[PDB]
Design a protein around this nucleic acid. Structure first.
Length: 87
DNA sequence: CGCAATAAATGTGATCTAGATCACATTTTAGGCAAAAAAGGCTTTACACTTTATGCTTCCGGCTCGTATAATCGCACCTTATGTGAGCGGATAACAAG
């Protein structure tokens, strides 16, 4: 129900906001890889290998960083490790 | 015709069974025909099969969610110590050529 010319304008500016945020979150999911292996000692030999253990650990950190609020009393080193041990 | 010698054939005749007779009265035999007891026949009725739609209920079954919590850390102690040679690529030292 939109013009083929203007419909592109809506999406072209969405790739700008998601890009400035994506690259900005690539620095938090790289310097915090030490916390993933830290709590990865509670689910070692059980049924899944260690190589596939930090798999659900890295995906969890990338989820918490997105739903994180710097304007909140709780820090990140505690709020992020919540979704990690959940995956 | 008389003579040889191992096998087969000969007589005896009193004793004791073996096999046969007769005509008529008694006892056995055969297959015959219904009845009873049994085989399957071919009916018509008594019941029983799992199946499958369903939906309602309680109990046991199988699966997740968020929350609450402390942490993102720390010693001293017990007992051993794989086997080799053969095949291979890579790193280093000694060498002749330029």
């Amino acid at each position: 129900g939109l013009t083929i010319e203007q419909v592109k304008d809506i999406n072209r500016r969405m790739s700008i906001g998601e890009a400035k945020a994506r690259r900005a979150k690539k620095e938090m999911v790289e310097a915090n890889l030490r916390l993933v292996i830290s709590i990865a000692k509670k689910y070692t030999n059980r049924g899944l290998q260690f190589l596939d253990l930090i798999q659900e650990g890295n995906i969890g950190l990338m989820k918490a960083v997105d739903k994180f609020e710097y304007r909140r009393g709780y820090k990140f080193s505690t709020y992020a490790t919540w979704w990690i041990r959940q995956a």
